[PDB]
Amino acid sequence: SKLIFVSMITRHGDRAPFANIENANYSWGTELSELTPIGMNQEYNLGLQLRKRYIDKFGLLPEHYVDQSIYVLSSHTNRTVVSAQSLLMGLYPAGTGPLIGDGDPAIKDRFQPIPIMTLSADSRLIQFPYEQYLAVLKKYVYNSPEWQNKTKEAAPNFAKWQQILGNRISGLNDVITVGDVLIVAQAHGKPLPKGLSQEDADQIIALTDWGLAQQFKSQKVSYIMGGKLTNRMIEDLNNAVNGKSKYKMTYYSGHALTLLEVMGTLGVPLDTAPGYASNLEMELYKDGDIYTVKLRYNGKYVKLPIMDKNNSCSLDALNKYMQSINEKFQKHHHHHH
Amino acid sequence: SSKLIFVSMITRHGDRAPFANIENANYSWGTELSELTPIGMNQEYNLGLQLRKRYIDKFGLLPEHYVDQSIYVLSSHTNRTVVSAQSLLMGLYPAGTGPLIDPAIKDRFQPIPIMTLSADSRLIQFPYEQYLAVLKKYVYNSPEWQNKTKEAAPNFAKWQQILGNRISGLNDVITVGDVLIVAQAHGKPLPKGLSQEDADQIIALTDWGLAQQFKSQKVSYIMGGKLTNRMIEDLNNAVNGKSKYKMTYYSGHALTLLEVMGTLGVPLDTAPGYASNLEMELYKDGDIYTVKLRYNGKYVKLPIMDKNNSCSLDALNKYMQSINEKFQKHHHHHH
Numbered sequence: 283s284k285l286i287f288v289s290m291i292t293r294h295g296d297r298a299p300f301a302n303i304e305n306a307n308y309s310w311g312t313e314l315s316e317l318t319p320i321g322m323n324q325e326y327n328l329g330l331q332l333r334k335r336y337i338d339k340f341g342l343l344p345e346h347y348v349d350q351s352i353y354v355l356s357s358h359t360n361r362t363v364v365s366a367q368s369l370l371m372g373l374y375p376a377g378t379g380p381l382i383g384d385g386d387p388a389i390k391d392r393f394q395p396i397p398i399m400t401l402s403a404d405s406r407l408i409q410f411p412y413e414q415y416l417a418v419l420k421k422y423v424y425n426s427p428e429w430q431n432k433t434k435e436a437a438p439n440f441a442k443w444q445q446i447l448g449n450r451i452s453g454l455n456d457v458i459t460v461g462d463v464l465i466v467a468q469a470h471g472k473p474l475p476k477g478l479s480q481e482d483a484d485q486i487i488a489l490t491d492w493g494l495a496q497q498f499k500s501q502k503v504s505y506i507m508g509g510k511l512t513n514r515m516i517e518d519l520n521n522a523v524n525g526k527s528k529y530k531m532t533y534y535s536g537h538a539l540t541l542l543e544v545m546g547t548l549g550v551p552l553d554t555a556p557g558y559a560s561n562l563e564m565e566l567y568k569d570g571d572i573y574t575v576k577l578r579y580n581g582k583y584v585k586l587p588i589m590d591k592n593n594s595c596s597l598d599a600l601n602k603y604m605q606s607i608n609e610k611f612q613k614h615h616h617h618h619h
Numbered sequence: 620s621s622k623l624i625f626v627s628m629i630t631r632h633g634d635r636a637p638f639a640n641i642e643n644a645n646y647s648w649g650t651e652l653s654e655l656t657p658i659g660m661n662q663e664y665n666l667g668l669q670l671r672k673r674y675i676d677k678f679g680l681l682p683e684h685y686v687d688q689s690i691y692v693l694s695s696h697t698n699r700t701v702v703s704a705q706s707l708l709m710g711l712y713p714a715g716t717g718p719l720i721d722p723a724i725k726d727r728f729q730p731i732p733i734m735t736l737s738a739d740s741r742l743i744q745f746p747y748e749q750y751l752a753v754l755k756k757y758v759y760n761s762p763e764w765q766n767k768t769k770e771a772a773p774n775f776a777k778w779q780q781i782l783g784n785r786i787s788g789l790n791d792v793i794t795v796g797d798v799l800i801v802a803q804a805h806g807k808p809l810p811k812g813l814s815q816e817d818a819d820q821i822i823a824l825t826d827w828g829l830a831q832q833f834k835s836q837k838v839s840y841i842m843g844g845k846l847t848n849r850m851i852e853d854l855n856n857a858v859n860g861k862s863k864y865k866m867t868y869y870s871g872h873a874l875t876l877l878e879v880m881g882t883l884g885v886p887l888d889t890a891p892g893y894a895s896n897l898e899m900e901l902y903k904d905g906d907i908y909t910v911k912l913r914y915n916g917k918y919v920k921l922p923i924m925d926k927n928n929s930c931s932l933d934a935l936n937k938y939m940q941s942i943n944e945k946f947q948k949h950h951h952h953h954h
């Protein structure tokens with residue numbers, strides 16, 4: 283069997299936060315929500331790892347980029363576009379880019395440009411727009427027994443955390459909001475907010491990780507947000523077999539939610555929120571007329587319920603699996619007055 | 620005295636392979652149809668270096684190391700325009716200037732985000748079939764097009780038999796002309812039986828035809844009014860506090876340049892070559908704001924501009940407003 287196609291999702295690299303902790307004076311060195319130099323480096327290094335895997339080891343891809351061999355689509359954010367660019371600088375590094383004339387580089391250092399398309403900001407394919415995402419949570423997650431139970435457990439800490447941090451803390455949603463800032467602060471070696479013990483910071487961060495993962499332990503929530511992309515990736519695999527597409531790889535540059543929603547849709551939800559440069563690959567193998575698929579998440583194969591002891595299933599089986607998921611969550615349409 | 624505070628820029632992409640094949644030739648391009656070639660990457664990279672010398676070294680509008688959220692880059696939904704923008708930005712902010720953590724990326728590359736429109740957007744280029752539909756309606760039956768057609772028509776049968784491709788109008792001449800332009804740019808031999816004289820005629824008609832389309836301000840406005848308005852709005856946003864960008868950059872096509880120049884009433888006489896570019900420059904001297912328009916390295920005098928190729932931003936706004944009013948559509952109700 284030979285690897286013939288891969289579809290990949292990444293989360294972007296280290297970024298600045300979206301929000302500020304009111305009672306802290308953190309300085310990030312880049313604008314809110316932008317990819318940091320560390321984040322660029324993380325994605326670049328992931329690119330180098332992917333070169334060793336899909337070029338050196340499997341030989342799916344060549345050492346010098348072939349035009350129209352990789353389709354890259356990013357959400358409409360700076361961090362996801364720059365993350366894809368940075369990753370591709372590792373996958374096809376300086377020294378491998380094209381020459382003109384007598385072996386003179388097209389671009390100094392033989393950089394290799396690889397096109398990245400973006401969705402519109404309004405697209406729901408790679409990420410739901412933030413307010414639409416929160417609306418799904420309000421409807422399907424916040425009143426769930428698991429969310430309410432965890433809320434009751436954590437609630438005795440809300441008043442204290444609110445007075446320490448300044449930011450409103452009146453539910454797990456607010457804990458998650460400030461938790462992201464604390465995660466960024468820790469990733470950048472910043473001091474704790476005054477009056478927030480390491481114990482308290484650890485608890486807030488733990489609740490944040492728990493909460494993000496809990497959202498997608500619902501296959502329904504996962505499908506609402508991720509059904510479209512999951513279907514599209516499987517269709518990419520099919521197009522690699524049916525002659526429709528000549529791409530060796532499709533790469534969707536996305537977010538924590540992108541990874542959570544696809545894993546959750548497939549019935550293998552994550553127990554932890556994806557860290558920076560987390561990544562998922564659907565690998566398609568060919569042995570004669572037999573086509574098989576494997577699913578890789580952060581460097582380890584994942585066993586879908588339909589897979590064998592070798593973490594593998596036929597593409598036909600994956601199709602049937604996805605079809606059943608689509609039917610399971612199909613909406614009953616109604617007419618109106 | 621007066622200082623440059625903002626620039627809005629359009630480029631055409633760099634050298635590319637053709638869209639079509641000449642039926643009776645066997646050209647091999649080295650990349651897929653319509654993709655940017657290595658020479659095209661080089662052209663855009665070199666333009667980037669030129670833009671660094673101008674807007675960083677000379678005017679100091681931009682800093683030597685990229686500031687996040689300082690440049691907004693929007694490309695049409697094509698590989699050649701995205702790769703052209705990326706190549707240009709590799710010249711504007713070259714290796715050695717990118718961020719450190721020890722370099723964030725080897726050779727200190729500097730990533731700069733590029734957004735793309737959807738393929739169905741009409742902002743930077745009309746989708747091809749919609750573009751041709753505008754030509755059919757407004758250009759192909761115009762007196763100038765018909766006259767040129769009659770002059771060239773005695774050559775159609777011969778060109779058709781030589782090339783294989785259908786040649787029954789100037790539109791077909793333009794179609795094969797692009798292939799001949801690409802062939803010449805890549806030093807390929809002429810198709811058998813096509814003399815250099817004939818190739819020159821076909822290419823000349825192609826250049827003439829592309830420019831002729833946009834000598835109509837109406838045609839230009841239909842396709843380019845939206846982008847022209849948007850670029851002027853970018854200038855206004857640099858003054859009114861709405862935007863903190865130092866530059867907006869629209870990565871586009873020959874049509875993008877033709878339509879904006881044509882909308883502003885300064886249509887080009889020749890079709891834009893690879894890496895052609897246009898800049899709207901905004902200057903501040905106290906409370907006085909002035910604009911200049913640059914095309915392929917030379918200032919262009921709008922009718923509203925003075926001997927110094929300059930006008931106030933207020934004047935530019937009034938000018939654009941009058942163009943909008945001129946081409947406003949009379950709406951109707953229906954049964």
Ligand SMILES: Nc1ncnc2c1ncn2[C@@H]1O[C@H](CO)[C@@H](OP(=O)(O)O)[C@H]1O
Nearest residue numbers: 293294300301409412462536537538539
């Ligand atoms: N204040 C905000 N504004 C816009 N998007 C936000 C946001 N806060 C969070 N997000 C989004 O919610 C996801 C889970 O934390 C994030 O994933 P990423 O950090 O982008 O992987 C954001 O997309």
Ligand SMILES: Nc1ncnc2c1ncn2[C@@H]1O[C@H](CO)[C@@H](OP(=O)(O)O)[C@H]1O
Nearest residue numbers: 631632638639744747797871872873874
């Ligand atoms: N066969 C084709 N398919 C799609 N777009 C095409 C095309 N032939 C020409 N174009 C488009 O028409 C413009 C003027 O020649 C081109 O400008 P550029 O070469 O992209 O600057 C194309 O966009």
